[PDB]
Design a protein around this motif. Structure first.
Motif, PDB file in Angstrom:
ATOM      1  N   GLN A 106      -8.201  -1.180  -4.744  1.00  0.00           N
ATOM      2  CA  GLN A 106      -7.461  -0.351  -3.803  1.00  0.00           C
ATOM      3  C   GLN A 106      -5.977  -0.270  -4.161  1.00  0.00           C
ATOM      4  N   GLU A 107      -5.390  -1.377  -4.630  1.00  0.00           N
ATOM      5  CA  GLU A 107      -3.977  -1.393  -5.001  1.00  0.00           C
ATOM      6  C   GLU A 107      -3.682  -0.404  -6.121  1.00  0.00           C
ATOM      7  N   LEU A 109      -5.499   2.127  -6.980  1.00  0.00           N
ATOM      8  CA  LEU A 109      -5.733   3.454  -6.434  1.00  0.00           C
ATOM      9  C   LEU A 109      -4.526   3.921  -5.631  1.00  0.00           C
ATOM     10  N   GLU A 110      -4.003   3.039  -4.766  1.00  0.00           N
ATOM     11  CA  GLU A 110      -2.878   3.400  -3.909  1.00  0.00           C
ATOM     12  C   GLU A 110      -1.666   3.804  -4.740  1.00  0.00           C
ATOM     13  N   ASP A 111      -1.359   3.017  -5.780  1.00  0.00           N
ATOM     14  CA  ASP A 111      -0.198   3.301  -6.605  1.00  0.00           C
ATOM     15  C   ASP A 111      -0.422   4.534  -7.470  1.00  0.00           C
ATOM     16  N   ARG A 113      -2.262   7.031  -6.536  1.00  0.00           N
ATOM     17  CA  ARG A 113      -1.978   8.087  -5.563  1.00  0.00           C
ATOM     18  C   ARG A 113      -0.477   8.289  -5.396  1.00  0.00           C
ATOM     19  N   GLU A 114       0.283   7.196  -5.289  1.00  0.00           N
ATOM     20  CA  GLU A 114       1.728   7.324  -5.162  1.00  0.00           C
ATOM     21  C   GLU A 114       2.326   7.917  -6.429  1.00  0.00           C
ATOM     22  N   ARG A 117       1.223  11.962  -6.579  1.00  0.00           N
ATOM     23  CA  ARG A 117       1.785  12.896  -5.608  1.00  0.00           C
ATOM     24  C   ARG A 117       3.256  13.178  -5.900  1.00  0.00           C
ATOM     25  N   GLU A 127     -12.755   9.364  -8.126  1.00  0.00           N
ATOM     26  CA  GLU A 127     -13.093   8.066  -8.706  1.00  0.00           C
ATOM     27  C   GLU A 127     -14.427   8.213  -9.426  1.00  0.00           C
TER      28      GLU A 127
END
Length: 139
Positions: A106-107, A109-111, A113-114, A117, A127
């Protein structure tokens, strides 16, 4: 040294890429003399297997390569064992999360995403299904 075995866990684009892979094998990055990179990966797409071989020619700017049409950017992730590819080319802008481990993270993925964007890549983050081999329908 982004060399060796990677898992291509995620991709996203500035536009619709209707060439969605249905699953992918690992990506192999081999280092060759001159600091060039050879990228090997197989993708399942609509029951067939795309065995891809892309040479990433080094350039003057560090971390930037050229391929195909496309210029590829390679830089590490702040998350353990993940790298991010950023690609501009033929016109698509596109980004890919590579990780050394296949397990979802998740980490990263989150970064990712950051990371995506902040460049205008606003389409869906896919994914990818993983598999050590690709086998075409009928074979």
């Amino acid at each position: 040294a982004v060399s060796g075995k990677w898992y291509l866990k995620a991709m996203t684009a500035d536009q619709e890429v209707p060439e969605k892979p249905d699953s992918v094998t690992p990506m192999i990055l081999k280092a060759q003399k001159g600091g060039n990179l050879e990228a090997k990966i197989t993708m399942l797409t609509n029951g067939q297997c795309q065995n891809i071989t892309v040479v990433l020619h080094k350039t003057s700017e560090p971390g930037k390569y050229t391929a195909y049409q496309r210029v590829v950017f390679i830089q590490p992730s702040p998350v353990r064992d993940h790298y991010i590819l950023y690609a501009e080319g033929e016109q698509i802008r596109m980004a890919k999360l590579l990780g050394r481990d296949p397990e979802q993270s998740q980490e990263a993925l989150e970064d990712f995403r950051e990371f995506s964007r902040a460049k205008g890549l606003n389409q869906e983050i896919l994914e990818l299904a993983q598999s050590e081999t690709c086998s075409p329908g009928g074979q």
